[PDB]
Design a protein around this ligand. Sequence first.
Ligand SMILES: Nc1ncnc2c1ncn2[C@@H]1O[C@H](COP(=O)(O)OP(=O)(O)O)[C@@H](O)[C@H]1O
Ligand SMILES: Nc1ncnc2c1ncn2[C@@H]1O[C@H](COP(=O)(O)OP(=O)(O)O)[C@@H](O)[C@H]1O
Ligand SMILES: Nc1ncnc2c1ncn2[C@@H]1O[C@H](COP(=O)(O)OP(=O)(O)O)[C@@H](O)[C@H]1O
Ligand SMILES: Nc1ncnc2c1ncn2[C@@H]1O[C@H](COP(=O)(O)OP(=O)(O)O)[C@@H](O)[C@H]1O
Ligand SMILES: Nc1ncnc2c1ncn2[C@@H]1O[C@H](COP(=O)(O)OP(=O)(O)O)[C@@H](O)[C@H]1O
Ligand code: BEF
Ligand code: BEF
Ligand code: BEF
Ligand code: BEF
Ligand code: BEF
Ligand SMILES: [Ca+2]
Ligand SMILES: [Ca+2]
Ligand SMILES: [Ca+2]
Ligand SMILES: [Ca+2]
Ligand SMILES: [Ca+2]
Lengths: 366, 366, 366, 366, 366
Amino acid sequence: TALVCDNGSGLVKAGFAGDDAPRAVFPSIVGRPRHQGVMQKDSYVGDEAQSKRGILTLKYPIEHGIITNWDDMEKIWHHTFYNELRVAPEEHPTLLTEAPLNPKANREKMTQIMFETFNVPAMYVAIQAVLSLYASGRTTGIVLDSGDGVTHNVPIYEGYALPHAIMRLDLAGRDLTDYLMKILTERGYSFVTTAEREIVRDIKEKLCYVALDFENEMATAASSSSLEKSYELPDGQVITIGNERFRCPETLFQPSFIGMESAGIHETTYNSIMKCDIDIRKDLYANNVMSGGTTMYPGIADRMQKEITALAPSTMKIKIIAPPERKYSVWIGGSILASLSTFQQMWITKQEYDEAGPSIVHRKCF
Amino acid sequence: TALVCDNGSGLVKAGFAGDDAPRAVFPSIVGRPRHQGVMQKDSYVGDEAQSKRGILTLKYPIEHGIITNWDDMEKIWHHTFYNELRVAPEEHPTLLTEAPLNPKANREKMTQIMFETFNVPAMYVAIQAVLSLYASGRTTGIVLDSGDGVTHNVPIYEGYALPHAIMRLDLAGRDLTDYLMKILTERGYSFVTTAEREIVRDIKEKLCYVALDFENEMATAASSSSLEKSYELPDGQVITIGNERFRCPETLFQPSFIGMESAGIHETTYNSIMKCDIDIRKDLYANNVMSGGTTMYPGIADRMQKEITALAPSTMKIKIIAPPERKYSVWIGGSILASLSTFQQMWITKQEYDEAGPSIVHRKCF
Amino acid sequence: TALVCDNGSGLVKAGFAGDDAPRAVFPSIVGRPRHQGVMQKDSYVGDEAQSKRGILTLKYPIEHGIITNWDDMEKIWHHTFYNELRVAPEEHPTLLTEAPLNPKANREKMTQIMFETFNVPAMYVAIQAVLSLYASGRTTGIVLDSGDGVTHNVPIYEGYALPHAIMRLDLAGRDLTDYLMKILTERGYSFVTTAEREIVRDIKEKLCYVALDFENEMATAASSSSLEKSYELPDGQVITIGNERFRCPETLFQPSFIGMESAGIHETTYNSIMKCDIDIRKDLYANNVMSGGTTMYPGIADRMQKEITALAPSTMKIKIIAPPERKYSVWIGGSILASLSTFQQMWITKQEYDEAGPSIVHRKCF
Amino acid sequence: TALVCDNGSGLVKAGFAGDDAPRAVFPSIVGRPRHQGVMQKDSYVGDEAQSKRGILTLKYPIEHGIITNWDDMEKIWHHTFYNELRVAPEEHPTLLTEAPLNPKANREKMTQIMFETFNVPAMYVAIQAVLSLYASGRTTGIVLDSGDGVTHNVPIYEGYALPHAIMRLDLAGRDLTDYLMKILTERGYSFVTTAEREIVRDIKEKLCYVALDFENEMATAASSSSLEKSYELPDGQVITIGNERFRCPETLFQPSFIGMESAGIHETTYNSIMKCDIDIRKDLYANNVMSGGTTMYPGIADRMQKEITALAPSTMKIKIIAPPERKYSVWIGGSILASLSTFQQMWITKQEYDEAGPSIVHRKCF
Amino acid sequence: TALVCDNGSGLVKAGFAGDDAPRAVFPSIVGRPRHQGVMQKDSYVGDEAQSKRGILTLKYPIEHGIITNWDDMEKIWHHTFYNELRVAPEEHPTLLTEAPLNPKANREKMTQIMFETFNVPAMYVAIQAVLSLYASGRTTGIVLDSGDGVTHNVPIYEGYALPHAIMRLDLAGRDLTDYLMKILTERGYSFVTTAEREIVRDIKEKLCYVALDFENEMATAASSSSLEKSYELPDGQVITIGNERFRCPETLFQPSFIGMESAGIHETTYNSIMKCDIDIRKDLYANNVMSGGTTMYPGIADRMQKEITALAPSTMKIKIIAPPERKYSVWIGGSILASLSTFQQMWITKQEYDEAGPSIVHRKCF
Ligand SMILES: Nc1ncnc2c1ncn2[C@@H]1O[C@H](COP(=O)(O)OP(=O)(O)O)[C@@H](O)[C@H]1O
Ligand SMILES: Nc1ncnc2c1ncn2[C@@H]1O[C@H](COP(=O)(O)OP(=O)(O)O)[C@@H](O)[C@H]1O
Ligand SMILES: Nc1ncnc2c1ncn2[C@@H]1O[C@H](COP(=O)(O)OP(=O)(O)O)[C@@H](O)[C@H]1O
Ligand SMILES: Nc1ncnc2c1ncn2[C@@H]1O[C@H](COP(=O)(O)OP(=O)(O)O)[C@@H](O)[C@H]1O
Ligand SMILES: Nc1ncnc2c1ncn2[C@@H]1O[C@H](COP(=O)(O)OP(=O)(O)O)[C@@H](O)[C@H]1O
Ligand code: BEF
Ligand code: BEF
Ligand code: BEF
Ligand code: BEF
Ligand code: BEF
Ligand SMILES: [Ca+2]
Ligand SMILES: [Ca+2]
Ligand SMILES: [Ca+2]
Ligand SMILES: [Ca+2]
Ligand SMILES: [Ca+2]
């Protein structure tokens, strides 16, 4: 059976092709002690690094979908195969994922490591937006994928991708976490260390939501306390946040909050549709597929529906597809793809790689 | 029973002899994907190519009544027999049509394909203007046939054709569509791709009409908005066109709008009558038969009546015959001809073709 | 003396009739601050916006030869008259230019602004391809004009234009810049903001060239590093680009690289010649005149000569005219035209405009 | 005339707008007797608390730029107006300062006290880094402000602040004093009380310096006694310190010495520049402005120049601006700002505060 | 086998590694005759000095964890090896202990004496709080060690020490004895000599306890005599003490009773936890480990539990670990450490000391 490994900027989703959910989901972090040991491993990965983060410096090897620090990324892959899935990598073909418009060397370097370090028999680097469409059972739609590092739009029509209309945005969950840390100082809460950033991410995933109308919610938050929620820190301290609950996800629709010049995810989706042929736009308007953890905010589908309806013509039916399992859509689609009989010819085997070279991995790639 | 296949530059009209209407009417297009497939046929024909045109490059195999690209034309014939009529070609004699003054190799090549690829038992290539006269139940008249690729005049008197008076004009519906695309840029509407050309053709067939007096309609369109009509594009955008509604069909009467030197269809009809013997002109003036989709513009019969009345002597009765079913007149006449008992001797059987050769197909041909 | 203002999608070329070069050449941009001012103009135009682009959002008012945002275009004209030429607009007749096949309202709106806002005594909107022919001292030739927004072919024979053979392509320099930004991500270089797009345009103008044979250059770039060039960014970072140097200009000959269906500039030029009368094609083959900044790539004249030679008959002499000053050919030709004695009757004065109306500006226009 | 009051975590700088130096500079301390009075005020402020600190418990109301203990802070403001400046607060508009990224309630509470307790006619809370740029006569630069409680970087370009690139570090002079107290125990010197902390601060300001290369200075200090300096305590005892002279300021560049995870001030400055637009980085590299008492260590400008030169590209000119009066740069800039004619509209008067409320004080604030 | 010698300010705990209790426990005193001998050693050490203290002047060589008088400390080590343990020092590696934040010369001087005077083969100076954690079988916790000279808090998490959060207080058992001597004069009891100080220490260890609520116990002691206890002096005199029983240990929680400015041991423990990372505070709250003779007061664990519960958040579980053998926790932990197999590489042998020098002894030291 094939391995499906979705290495994101934030989380590692790993499992076996054919299953309905990833078997191993853990943070893509490597932690190293930043104090003096007096009584003791050198590095910790994943959930083990998350439980001991109080004395660790946490580092993400993947930044904005791009693998920095190839030594730490190799520890995460080693932790995935031997400690989480408990399999021998040299027995299973491995399906990997990558964000579109990535550097060419990123895919070549991970292919060399999979073939020469873990000695996988075959491998394949899939398109993440294509996998999200497999998960929804569709062949047509524009995918809005937003994870921890990358937000990107990929329109697909009847199984054909339109690469010239692909949008990529280096604004995702980790930038929202950093912005939440900044605006929490307005209430006197100071989160600085990499371990405290993990606390702010937990606050974001539990209390943040997308406002249907931002300016009306700012007026409501300033006239009462009905939007105030409390949160207990790991040391028993209780913090209270008000308009920060919806100001943090609002950055997705107003990237100027963090100094970015790009347009919000609603205008980026609309601009991507308007670059497609006029004859396919009606089907794209009706199949806006959301995927990734950053699309899990309460109210983001209703907000996107409202924003795109205001940009599109009035006779168009805007339909946002947001399944409840969309946080694992890329992995679920990869599990479906790696199980298809027509896909078994797409594997890049170790033999083909020794003769063709690193250039064989850049086919059907954008 | 015999098959009647009217392969035009724009539409394929196919059916069985004896019926009153073609059973299969679909565009004569072959579409091929112009993007990358990621999730898938190689080519699409007819209405299937029209529904997926957003991701296809559409190509017409027939240009100006002449078959270019014989590989695509063979796919359209294959699509016609097996997917539209659902018959075995080797069981029915096939009646085909061709525009007059065509290259000799065009008819020879289609006869070789019908006999050696589809293995038809017998076939016959009819004269399209003769078929239009069969459809109107006449034996005398001058036929003005205008389709997607060819406009031609053929005078017939008491069943005898006058080939020296035949006029042919490579200005028809597809040139009007291209001219409409050009003058739509004056309002800021940009239609470029082959798929958008199909949209402009739909605009032409719904909103364009022939002005009775062109210069008076230009003054009316410039003094008010009573001639403005709106049209909703496939993506919900609404465009508004004014004098373009009658400027596009006006090219038929003023071919200089598209840089052509020839005279309009009214002067071409009159010049064709004036090349006929003086003793038959009175009967030709009273039997101007229109056929083809390009004669379906509202007001074109009243305009032709006015223009020819101004050219002919005042004592002549000018009568334009424009039946409501004239868009299928060639097929309807072919269905009538292929059902006649006196025609069953005109079939060119496979046996006669093996001994006589390609020269047998050029009898009663001009 | 008359003012000659060539308002392109990318650059403003302004000066006085009779001079040999434009006096004012600056980018056609309006910049507005996108941060918070704490210590301060509202908007910056041209080279002033280019020097402070780090804190500005840059916007082009002209897109694909069409003026969007008429408020920003009026600031550029105001910046041109009072800050660059330092003249009173109400004292000089102004010669303007426009791309062919433009919307009618574009020319009418700029005429209303010139007469009612700047109060020019007379004005004239010239044909850009006619001006390029004046600059080369020719009366016959097919002009290939390619700037920042529009690429168009206009054949002219003995002083007569053939409007039906005019080709227009909304693929020019700005689309090549956007494509270069996309393929620079393959090496890990991320240019996103409107200010970074100006950096990529500078990379394009310095390092990009047209390959004589594209597939052979791809093999050379993949077998060595002789095609690698370095470039120092404004912050001291040095980037290295290889095959992107000739892949970016190759889009002009293969518009499918950016998802466009149209043919390259070589086939468009050939198709334009083949729509002209057969008796003038020999003179058009010998007078292919290049103009505009996008024709300034090294090797584009040799590539066009090779591509058209392969399409034209072997007995035809293909001659590409590419003068070194062809980046200002439209302005230079306008300076020549506005100085002719026979042209002084072509000015549309303010008096003629008050009585005739906006319709007077659409004479000798296509 | 306006009052300029720079309330820092360590020192109060107060004076009149227009002067070149603060009139009143005294420690921001409140001292209360911790013994039994037998022969007698309740509390002492500033230099009076510093002279009697032997029998007092000294407390700073401001910690890390944030006002704790609002009763003690009100005594310091009262001591400033009536005992140091000897003015009536209800006659002069008061310019106050605050560190960036402070809690919103800190500024609101000090505005309420200034308007309702001291009854100032108008007031304004300025940005401290903007004032430091006014003091240096610049409109562009990245300010490194380091006082007793806060270290922060604020990049400013052409008068526009980039708030998203602002860095704040709760590591400043008071943390260096505490670290010096800790490492002085290695030589047997025990400083424990709040009065002895004032002695250690005096040792730091007289004997500590920044080493150009830290590891080479550690080797020099361990091989001889040329770096040993003596210091006479208030009771005549003489202490000798060696490598502690440069180990204490080294914490600014290696915050791990005190258990902090953040990067040093050199990497924080570089990271702040790298978050700014690429087009402004060259001007920021050349205008690194230092301000605050913690930048007064001998050799800190040469060390920062060396550290940033190693991080920046080699073609960049790194220039550290460290004027001799930079310990009062915030006050000097505030005196310049409060004297500008264009600033007299920025005052928040008592009338505007009664109607708008506390929300009026958070304009042009970050 | 290794020797474990815990040289405290008050008691010497010496024995062999592997045993469960120290073999030799005697006071760290040197006594010299202060009268005239008429009928006779020069100095007495330990229990021999304690039995003849009536005619001796008793002196502690160690003050506040720091060795003063190195001649007397060498007599105590000599008395320990040859008279108490009866071993040859040159045959056993010796594990020594030291209080944190001690002068560097203290450890260097005792290492020189152990290697050059007693000629031990190897030695090691351990961290006393680490040893107390070994004794409790824990790897996580904050140790509150309070002996005769030093009180210190050391937080340890998962075997990693946080040195920046270490608190040290020069207030311990000997200061409580001196305070008891002072408040015993209120009842007319005069203890002055160094021999009478040993009597007061015996009173403290037998009658003193920690009040759960101090102000309520003062009211109870002033309203009855239920808290009065009697004590028989060595000469048969009986003294009675009331509120002095709990006023003496109360100094640990209110150091102002003896003129010290520092906070009590409960606030010092809480302040140490609040300097640790927020993610480890919950585990530190549940593992407050007590060690040392000064933690042996009845009721001190219940008082510390009550005081820290009032400072910590209500959702935190405060657990004070006070084992009955905690007076020897440092020695017991040292016996465990010196028996570990992984520790046998940590010994500093005589050979390593001759080449590396005194600097080798300051590794893993704070
Ligand atoms: N319930 C939630 N609400 C908001 N954000 C969430 C939620 N759950 C996860 N996220 C965010 O999603 C991001 C990671 O999702 P994922 O799609 O796995 O990213 P990647 O694949 O790039 O690692 C994280 O930054 C996390 O903060
Ligand atoms: N209602 C209509 N009005 C105007 N033009 C029409 C209409 N219907 C069809 N046409 C035009 O008729 C042309 C095709 O008619 P047809 O006679 O079938 O041509 P052919 O036989 O050459 O394919 C097309 O170009 C189409 O645009
Ligand atoms: N040396 C060069 N090489 C390639 N492209 C160039 C060069 N110089 C200018 N260009 C391109 O030419 C375009 C503008 O030329 P121009 O003819 O002035 O356009 P317009 O008139 O439409 O503004 C710009 O997009 C610029 O990138
Ligand atoms: N000569 C000096 N060398 C080193 N540090 C100094 C010197 N003079 C002052 N300082 C430090 O500067 C700090 C206060 O400077 P300042 O900028 O006034 O801080 P704040 O404005 O936050 O009160 C004090 O902590 C002091 O120790
Ligand atoms: N039962 C007791 N109650 C209160 N204090 C005690 C008791 N037993 C011993 N002590 C005190 O503990 C101190 C010494 O304990 P220890 O931890 O051995 O100190 P050190 O290791 O510094 O010598 C002495 O000052 C003694 O008075
Ligand atoms: F890397 Be994640 F998909 F943003
Ligand atoms: F081919 Be159609 F009849 F113009
Ligand atoms: F507007 Be430019 F001439 F493309
Ligand atoms: F409060 Be100081 F400016 F650090
Ligand atoms: F020296 Be003891 F441990 F206070
Ligand atoms: Ca992902
Ligand atoms: Ca036809
Ligand atoms: Ca131009
Ligand atoms: Ca300050
Ligand atoms: Ca001890």
